[PDB]
Paper text:
CysG is encoded by a gene fusion between a C-terminal SUMT (CysGA) and an N-terminal bifunctional dehydrogenase/ferrochelatase (CysGB). The N-terminal enzyme module, CysGB, is a three-domain bifunctional dehydrogenase/ATP-independent class III ferrochelatase12 that performs the final two steps of siroheme biosynthesis. The C-terminal enzyme module, CysGA, is homologous to a well-studied class of SAM-dependent uro’gen III methyltransferases (SUMTs) that catalyzes the methylations to generate precorrin-210,13.
D262 comes from the CysGA module, opposing D104 but adjacent to R260/R261 and sitting above the tetrapyrrole nitrogens. Therefore, we wanted to know if D262 from CysGA was important for catalysis, so we altered it to an alanine or an asparagine (D262A or D262N). No gross structural defects were apparent. Both complemented cysG deficiency, but the altered enzymes produced the fluorescent intermediate, with defects in the dehydrogenase and chelatase activities. R261A, D262A, and D262N retain some activity for both chemistries. It does, however, interact with an arginine that directly binds the sirohydrochlorin, so helps form the active site to bind the tetrapyrrole in the correct orientation. P133G/H, R260A, and D262A are more sensitive to increasing cobalt concentration than D104N, R261A, or CysG.
Author numbering:
A (entry chain B): 1 to 271, 276 to 358, 363 to 456
B (entry chain A): 1 to 270, 277 to 361, 363 to 457
Amino acid sequence: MDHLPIFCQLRDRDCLIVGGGDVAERKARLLLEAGARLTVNALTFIPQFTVWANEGMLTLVEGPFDETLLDSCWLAIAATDDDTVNQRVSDAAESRRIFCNVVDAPKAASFIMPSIIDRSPLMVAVSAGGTSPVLARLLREKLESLLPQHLGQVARYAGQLRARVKKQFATMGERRRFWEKFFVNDRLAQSLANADEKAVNATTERLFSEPLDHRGEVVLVGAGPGDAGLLTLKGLQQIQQADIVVYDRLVSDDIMNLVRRAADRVFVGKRCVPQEEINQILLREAQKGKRVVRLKGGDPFIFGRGGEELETLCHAGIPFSVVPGITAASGCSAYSGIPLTHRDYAQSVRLVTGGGELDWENLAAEKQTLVFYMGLNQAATIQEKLIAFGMQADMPVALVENGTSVKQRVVHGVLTQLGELAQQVESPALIIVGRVVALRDKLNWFSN
Amino acid sequence: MDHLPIFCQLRDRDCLIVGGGDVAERKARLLLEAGARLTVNALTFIPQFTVWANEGMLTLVEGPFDETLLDSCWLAIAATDDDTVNQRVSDAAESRRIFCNVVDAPKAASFIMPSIIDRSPLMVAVSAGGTSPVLARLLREKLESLLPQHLGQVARYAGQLRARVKKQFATMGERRRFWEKFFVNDRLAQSLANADEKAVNATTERLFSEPLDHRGEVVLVGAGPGDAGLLTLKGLQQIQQADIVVYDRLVSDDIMNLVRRAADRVFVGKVPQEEINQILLREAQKGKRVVRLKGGDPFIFGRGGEELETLCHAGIPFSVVPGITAASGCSAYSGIPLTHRDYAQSVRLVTGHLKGGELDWENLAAEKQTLVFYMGLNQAATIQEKLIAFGMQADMPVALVENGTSVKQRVVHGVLTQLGELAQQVESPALIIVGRVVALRDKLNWFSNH
Ligand SMILES: Nc1ncnc2c1ncn2[C@@H]1O[C@H](CSCC[C@H](N)C(=O)O)[C@@H](O)[C@H]1O
Ligand SMILES: Nc1ncnc2c1ncn2[C@@H]1O[C@H](CSCC[C@H](N)C(=O)O)[C@@H](O)[C@H]1O
Ligand SMILES: [Cl-]
Ligand SMILES: [Cl-]
């Protein structure tokens, strides 16, 4: 153990920063966030410091380092470019037994500032003693994605329920299992963050009244179009807490590798499976008291039949929520260099599927970006109908297969080639029609 | 934040523990492992303090509390079962500006001792400030299974290489690129764990020999519509690594809280477009990792294309991270699915703000679609008038979602003949949704009613 981590209470304690540039501004913001009573001593200050000074959030002392500014200080930070000044600061702090950090020389003085993940009152700190700040960042990154943004409010509320938990749950083991489902309960975290004090109370007594091993809910999670980096933080957090994950073929294998190892997996994709068995599967797993994640390709509410699955759950009294995902159109647009809107090119974007028939007159109108989902089989018809209803023959068209994935393929041309272009791709694929398609020559940054 | 975590260097620094029982023993063990010069002042001591005193590892002072023992100290710990004594210690420490922990009273005095995961020199500390020891324990145990034990040897080797990296690589960008490759080479980690110095040396020499991509870059990142949990994993990695983040009014404060503290932030709010272009260009040509952070999705009414065209003209590399557009976010969080079993064949994302141009109202009035108007609040009265005049039924359900996905989300709803009036009950940023799917809110709304 090279350093001892301690969590300091800085509120209304005098602290000194020496320096007044960008580096000192970052440290000053951190200490202000911690509630420090801050003096900043520098030869010159960048504008952010004078702003804070007139707002009375700190004190500025312009001029050379004055060691007597340390006389009632609890922490000192030397944040200048000048090794000689930093050494004067760290020597003066050391003689007064004030913990001191030199930003550009972590091993020079008496404390190191770690990477911080703030979920107050819950806090996580990572440091490798100045050996490995890039590693500390890589870990901080990971932890940021894993810790829900509102976990702190849950932690405060947990403190208030401690006495109730121990009187209800006689044993440490039973308590532990309660806390485990308490700290992952989604409606609790969201009710707390929304100040929905009635929803807090309803979730709170469902947690005390339901059987200890029951934690039944359903979360519809949008997996995005393929690239595992396009999952949301919340979607990752939910699949890390699932007892059961129900997924189909349009959820990428890369996404499924992020699923909690101990979660049961139920594949409902087509290896011809109707929708009602899926609705039933979700119903029964949740009634078992399990935490069910329904993982869907893209966004659950865009041609995903997500509403159909939730209506099944609504009458049965099963709590549910929805985590939106990147729909295929947004993902393919970004990864093929084809923005769905651009300047004057398109006043609107239409997301359309390939009883009833498409309004071909409507689809042919100018100033649109058309995006066809599940439309490959209708591709030759789309070419002839658009041409037959007045869309200009030179209108650019593109097809994007397996968008955002490492096997993405993008074919392109003009509308008179559309039916022939669709031959060269297979599902899952998008058809994009409109002037924005021509922008791919400049904006394609991904590799085909 | 409730506390500021700091990692203190205690070697040869005087510390004091008051108390001589099991609690004091556990804190003493930590301070001794950190190299502190430790005095323990207590009326009685459990036997482990004798063993340590006999080995010369600390000093015992048997007796009541001696305030003067704090005189040379950097830290103090009150670890008695006597709350009156503990408060005398914390008062004496306070007067001397000595950080002090009262073990049985986390909210009193001036520092808390966190739970520690040791991968020395790598260390992770976790605490809930006494509010929930169970949460800290559960987190501590999960982080423990997440951090491989090889990490300590990797970090130790990195520390040994730091002098060489500084001498061989002139710029900050080059050194960062070296470290990013160093810390994810699994073979190097295994070779360190096996004490295989030939393999360590071979991989190391190859790593120092690789060229580094000296170029700055611009990443367009979609922040999503507000809820910080809706940022993508890749988007988070971009803003946790960026040198500069250029952001707008429509990027929520909670998203900005995920931008790493070391990045410079540049607010381009109220700034015309080609002035933003100029900022991105200037910073990227200086070799920085630039993120342009935009509300929602960058390629849906974001002007994301114009920015990228300027960079392509200048030879600057760029990429795009899509985000959750306002339509998808407000859909999920208001309980209004954008499509549903032949309620809606089609979704139309439309701007309500054009460059003498006018929308194709015949087209927008078509049946069996969901209309979503972006920046249409000021035009809501005209939208109602035109949709009615081109045949949309007067009772078509409509909803307006203000600050969708945030804790301040407000939803108002009604029928098309109320759209102009409903719009005066909300302010920007708001989305207008028109379509039969709006009626599904009563059965699918899970978020709140504000
Ligand atoms: N990675 C991908 N690349 C191109 N198209 C995709 C795709 N993933 C899904 N799609 C499209 O979506 C259709 C299935 S409908 C499901 C759509 C999904 N809810 C979403 O939001 O994207 C496929 O036929 C295909 O047209
Ligand atoms: N959180 C939010 N709630 C409601 N509407 C929002 C919103 N965030 C953005 N918008 C809408 O988006 C408009 C700006 S245009 C920018 C849209 C963004 N690129 C996206 O993909 O969503 C605003 O006028 C408002 O209509
Ligand atoms: Cl480090
Ligand atoms: Cl705690």
